[model samples]
Target chain A: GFRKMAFPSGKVEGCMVQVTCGTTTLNGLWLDDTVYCPRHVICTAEDMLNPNYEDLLIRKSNHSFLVQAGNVQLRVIGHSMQNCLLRLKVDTSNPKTPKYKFVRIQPGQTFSVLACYNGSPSGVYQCAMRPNHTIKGSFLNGSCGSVGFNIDYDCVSFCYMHHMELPTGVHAGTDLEGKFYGPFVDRQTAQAAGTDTTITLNVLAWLYAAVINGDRWFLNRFTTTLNDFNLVAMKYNYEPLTQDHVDILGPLSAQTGIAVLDMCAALKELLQNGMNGRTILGSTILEDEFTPFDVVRQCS
Target chain B: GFRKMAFPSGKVEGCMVQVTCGTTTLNGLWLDDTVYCPRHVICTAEDMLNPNYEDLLIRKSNHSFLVQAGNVQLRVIGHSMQNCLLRLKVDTSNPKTPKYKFVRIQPGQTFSVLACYNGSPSGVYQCAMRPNHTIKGSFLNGSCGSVGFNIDYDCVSFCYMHHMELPTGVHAGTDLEGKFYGPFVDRQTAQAAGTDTTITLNVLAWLYAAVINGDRWFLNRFTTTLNDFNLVAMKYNYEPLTQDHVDILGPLSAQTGIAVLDMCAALKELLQNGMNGRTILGSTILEDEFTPFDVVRQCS
Candidate 1:
């Protein structure tokens, strides 16, 4: 997947080089026929006196890749004895509490995510989104199971909805009685949206527009959706879809899940053709078909 | 510069692809005509129920690069309005302490490295390596100037010595009297290494061998050098070399700093020639000229 291109055969050392990709330009160094991106800047008192030292995009080692993007220092371990690809080392030796005091993630179907703080036992997720947007399901352990564990800092943010491929004109909003409605405008926004317990149709339409439009201007609103889903995934457990839940969501096939798969396929095609725009046209969804994506709605 | 190679122009959706670089093979996804490295894994409760979702190396946005290598999450901002290139945001709202209680970096010749935490004024640098390897110099502030600022976790590691190009057979180690001696062995290792304050000749020889050889087996010992240098840089201020620090380091020309520069050039040559071996052969240092590099020894 990494595109490794060769430069001139001459021994290039201490030379400033720049690479242009599409409309973007990256300033780098031409060293050993390879252009190294000088992304990490090193600040030292010596610089104030001499001003000779410069930044280099060199790897910490051949076995690991270190990316110091501001305070976020990531060391990707290629091969380790732990067998676990990810490692978040926390100083349990210290008694101070951390910023994300508590955290929880909704479990996936195949693997049960776990967490541990110190000497405490695993599986202690605490935060979850709810009626008040409180954190719930999983436990908060600085220590945790293999895949996604918190050790020192940096927060883990994701939501089940983020991964879901939603169909066009469909909204997952529920009303006070738990009845779902879509095809654009919300029943309350059409009436009492300002005070309804259900997610307003206007909000849902905006969320869909923000995501589908893929414009940077809507990033804040998109992030709000992410946060909402993150809370929901953290606090509640994922169970089988209730008959009521399905009833509210409406028909599961052709009009919904089947259309979702079709829309995703169209987006995938556009990506294949190197298209930058994010709009889909016409009726790409199948009129008659069954797809098992109803499980994505089982979040409680 | 980034190496961007085009993949086959096929709409290969949801297919697993592997890219092999030398002995390293990375698991990726072949979507559209591009293959993406699946480096960031997302853990969710849905995976426990559906187990269909997988990891992908997607950017957080087209303008930012996100690398979630373990607990360290790096978001490299390609463009921002701040103008300052680096950012380390801390939650001043939380009164809790962080893991890197304090940190400091010896300044570079050009930049006067500054730091700050919370509401503290900038330019605070604390902790430096010393006689007992205690942190010194700078003040402890969660906030800092551009470049290397500590926010939540991840320690900034580096030493002035780590960046210095040392001449072969020269040891920076000093005795209680602050005198230096080295060719292959130390002065006291030839005498009473068990109690002498001087770095033993044998130890100097080993350090020389460890650095010059560039073997992975000696990484732990190599790291010890990094730590020692890190502490030294933190505590001391950089200044012009005096008759003392210079005298202890031996002849500043061919036998020391000049040769140090020569050795660095040789290492650079090796890198350019695609030679994996780290050894440099006979007499590459110039004996008859003066080059201003002696200031590197002025750590006080």
Candidate 2:
């Protein structure tokens, strides 16, 4: 589902600039964004003693996204083997505009989600991995709907980075629980498509430490729930579908058991929308092409 | 009920230790008969670094309970205050028996419970509060039923202490609720005599550290059920004969405007127990007590 988009390859180095959501980015660097110098940016007893310093910039080779601002440093370590780095320098001196900038990056790895005072926009941002330069990608807003793209390189992904104003009377108490769903599509060519396949889902939990209000409180709780689902679906043969397909599948399919006709209909619908529609049909018309009963017979 | 107990003279040093029902002397020593030292002990960063010649003996003092072992130098400060001063020589040779002993004072200025380690008997112990060098009272294993004494000077009290061998079917996961009564009386008196008056009852919650296993867990889960006075009385309260009186007076007594008769009955019970009960009474008790009935009788 996530491998459809293509990413650039190169090493990009610089301080984290800013994170944006749609047209809006979070302004006012809070305490969490304060930056520290190189040696002081890392967590060490020595650095802790004399924490007063300007923002920190990380080296690309380290593969660690770390930035220092004033006295505090924010380090971003990529998940799993992808090992993407996103570091930002926090500026505590100016409470209004706590500037965050990227520092450095390793070769063949592109950095997404720039560090800035403005809040990150609500959309999917793509990046191409490369050995020694910045790879460019678009920061899609909420308008992207439910489209899936194949990225040439492994990437970090998330949705709706902007803050959501929850309605009143919603007491998320100390513990909050909820569900999230997104579309996913495989990006294999028709010739190389195999009968047996596996998919891995990686979810990252992010928090906005700058927001003083209780807004950030639910972020950690929200990420924890999403991360749990990522772990559960990693081993299962899971299928991702659009809202339209989900609605159709709900009504046409039997509520229980493996209904052959339902499976055929769903598969046909997926093939028509996916990349291998014509390839699977070739020249011969299968027996299940007309009658729904024939579709169940072939499946049996 | 607690207010009715005699307040300490303030001059007596140790924490008030009350032996509700037991044969024990007010001796200062612990289970091994180790006399408690009056000198205060302090563990400092400087002492931890340097080494000295004399053997250090750590003493539990008013300031802190930790005591170092060995030949040590201790200085005496003021005599009347609860804390004393001491200095110690460093000894790092013996690995098994280290130089220091740490003691934690019981919270709420209450009595302390000391259990035997090798072949000694477990019992309640109390130390001086003001002068700091006196042993006020203690209780033996089988003392609850026969003898009782009130150590009003810095007294420490306890509900119950016993060696109970639980049966096999009483495995883990089984709930043991309201199964046993105390080995000692809830309250007792040295002499019995007094007029009817109103008394006050003050209940205090026990203190517990985060690491220690305590009843707080059970209380937190079943707070509503536990708060049910009828349930608590049936399970824990000993005097069933007075159940009706408690039900009528208990709730109302919490607020102001208690009936004169009700107050008199409570006072009479407390005074008969040989203690100076809290409730005060006027000289014309008979007339005031029957005022409600008198008014009703006149109306009839």
Candidate 3:
């Protein structure tokens, strides 16, 4: 229907992305192998601080996008507690600064405040909750980021994930590096979180770890966790890169627009600020794997 | 013996101001009133937000004092500036929180640490800088709230001030209701600036309106406005009107703890957590006189 742009999950490796409501536009994730020659499609990883590529950063996560516009910040919450009422309004009469309008909405109605708003929203004339806590729209823009990077933690926090395991996408000659987190866990059941939410998160961390350590065994098992909405192996219209398409049978194919994803800005911010994730290795990974996030900081 | 508690400017109705590095104390301004038979002595008109108070919270000014013990935020600048040599060490080699140590001495002689601390400071630590950013603090515990009422602006943004036209301790025929704002403009010259600096600030919005509206007449004045630390007015030996004192002051003086300058925990999350400040009112023309600041929420 109204297909807005999206990515494999939290990682929009190769292309820049953007969202608008303020008439202005921000960055996006960048990718490669254009629509015209959809050959070996891949993503590009940029160093966190590289300002030029900053517009293309995206934080790691699944489902739900956090959108920030102007001086306003809001969370789409979660798919579980999605329909909860929300309202967005402004408090103009306040003696100090005015802020965006907020209110609570339910089944398409609701809202609240915190800081430095000019008291209003942009674009989306009919802005409302979509696909539960996570969906795409105009005025909402990208909670992931606009001109700057913001660490997206809804999925991370909501899932009780202390951190994410780093993913280096394909190792040098699969299974080359021996370290592997064996006995992978199931993703679906964990989401139902029988007891605690971190259960699913732990599984994801372990799985990504295995893949990074060159565990072809786990790479054999994949449930993308880019941003929850990512629901596929992403073979594209090439459909699983099947027999007709696998050997280049699907002739003339192209990625068309150098599409962008939400996390572009978020990705860099987390990298610079703080990222709780596991270190998997380089499938000869992106040259931009900058800072080391191995040291753990204590909060007492 | 050392004591560090301080104020901006007044002659605290009483005494007792102290702070220490470990066990040593510093200066505590003295006044005319005594626990034996207190009278006329009082503090000044400062808001709770003034950063000078914040410095006081940190301990160590132009005199002698430096204390540590905490980790509260994330600040990573540089040390190529070496004395810029800084680190936030805590008892816990935490997997989460971190702070820094501090130092104090004549020109350059020592250093130390405290809770998740980081180092140095933002501005003047002298009690003299307290009233600059905004006006608020207390001795009667709160500004005057307990025995008076104050609209602390500590939680406010920074800006130059105008006059404070004092009113009587009460509204009735106390002869205290004289329209006053003192040659209150060093608050301006110190804003006219030179004299220190700040005159242009007056011509901006509020003060001029007040002058044009009876406000400008006030800016034509000046005295000082460092951090806004006017130091003088603090006192509380009979503090918190303990029972015996309450008997004489009456059950009405129960707020004895004139309270400390702040919105009180219940005021913000402090209520949900902690609160601070004192309050005292002297609005002769505003409330009983009614005009701008009084129309509060009903904007129409």
Candidate 4:
């Protein structure tokens, strides 16, 4: 049988572990007396900057991913535990909602709404699983379709992995920290989420807060409100803080701060370039849908 | 002071080594009595399938990569050892070249030539660093614009890292293997390439052969003719062979075989869907511009 064998732990303090993949034996990395080994193919800017690039498709499962925006395109990653179809639309009316014509999307897909109209953008774009479902701020730009701003939201999941390269002056361990801003109606569920969730949601909430004047909507969107936020204080510990605490804080603040800023910067540039045409942004993936997070209830 | 340290060698074969980044110390993987550690953020299918996605931009240096084509977009990576402006034009007429309106591209950029005209593509696409400068067969599709097929070529560098997920029945150490079919005009240069180059070029060559009837042009494109090929025999050793060997061979043949097939299949789907509009391909990065490859002359 073809089995992927990962070396979990080693006996000695600094010894290497041997891992198996298919039929080959590879040198496995030992960490904390635990072996860490997984095969990964390096993806470059060439592969990343495609029109909904190939290697970015959802191949492992049939579930849908979250929708992410880049300088030149928008990627729809599978963010849910179950398979679900996704769609994109817009809404920005005060007195009334516009007629919805959701754009259908697969779990692994990329789309350029502007390419259809041969136009550009400038306005606030929101996201939603459907209408007002997980209404999160995605890209800040004007609407392209005849309706309001463009909205992107898939089956939002709690499992996620985010990566961010810090901007100048921001230190990962010094400047920034993360926390979950919540109502905690379901204390037990919220606590479970505290243990099961990732800091990516925290950073995302901060981004939404930065752009939208009222960030509470996002925090309150769910019954338990396990979404995240950041504080200006220097709570440098990795301990999990609850809503009862004045500040919900965690590690990698500097990295998160820079990630939020950089994400915003990239979005601004991407939307603007979206108006102009196509453009490649950076050589990094800020956030992604991590399926293992759903099963492995542990933070990295 | 900010410091980054990777554990090089561990005393034991399966012990965890500590690695450092900025102010944080992380458990590092010890491999073969050596510690392996590098900071990396996970990128998802959402990140990879953007229209010339962001994280795909060249940030480390000003040099260009290569121009890669995806299903719905085309990425122009910084491929050169030095910064060089790239352009796209077509040439198909015998004894005639169309008034070249090279589409100028920066080292880090993505362009959808079709979005400009609101069109699609078909015909045999070619590539070059300019006209007649190491031409390589890029995507197998018809031309776009008011000329021959759309040609994508950049300041291609020898430094690269390629990743491929094998298709069914195509084992990594079996099924298929790689070989470079060449003129070896510059024996020294070819040998240098043999030592310096990666198996990615070999896969690319095999892809070219599978599509084009006569693949000799690509092999003979360079003076040294150190480009690659594949064989139907089982020479499954990680050894290098010269042109004198009837069948030039190397490793990862199965992976390469599937990669070539997948690339072609994806291209067909991409160009066809390109005719329709936007579509995401797969969650993977097949090849990329590896800056470290330039400095680290050893294969992984």
Shift of residue B150 alpha carbon in model 2, Å: 9.4
TM-score of each prediction: 0.17, 0.15, 0.17, 0.21
Error of 2 at A231 (Å): 15
What is model 3's DockQ versus the real complex? 0.01
True contacts kept of 1: 0.00
Report the lDDT of model 1 for residue A131.
25
- How do the residues A126-194 of candidate 2 rate in per-residue lDDT, one tens digit apiece? 232221121222212211111112212223121111111112100010000001111101111122212
| CAPRI accuracy category, model 2 | incorrect
Give the top-scoring candidate (TM-score): 4
Per-residue C-alpha lDDT of model 3 across residues B110-227, encoded as one tens digit per residue: 1010000112110011111111121221111111111111112211111111112122111100001111112221111232111111211111211112222222122222222211
Q: What is candidate 1's lDDT per residue for A1-300, written digit by digit as tens?
A: 000111111111112232222222323222222222311112123432333222211322323333222233323332111111112221122121212222232221111112222211222111112222111122221221111222221222212110001122111221111122222121122322121122211122222322332321222211223234334423322122233332433333223332222222332333235224332211111110101211121110
Instruction: Give lDDT tens digits, candidate 2, residues B29-89.
Output: 1111122221211223343233121222223322332222222212222112122212222
Reported per model, the fraction of native interface contacts reproduced equals 0.00, 0.00, 0.00, 0.00
| Per-candidate alpha-carbon RMSD to the true structure | 31.6, 28.9, 28.4, 27.5
Q: Which stretches of candidate 1 lie over 4 Å from their true place?
A: A1-262, A271-300, B1-300
lDDT: the better of candidates 3 and 4: 4
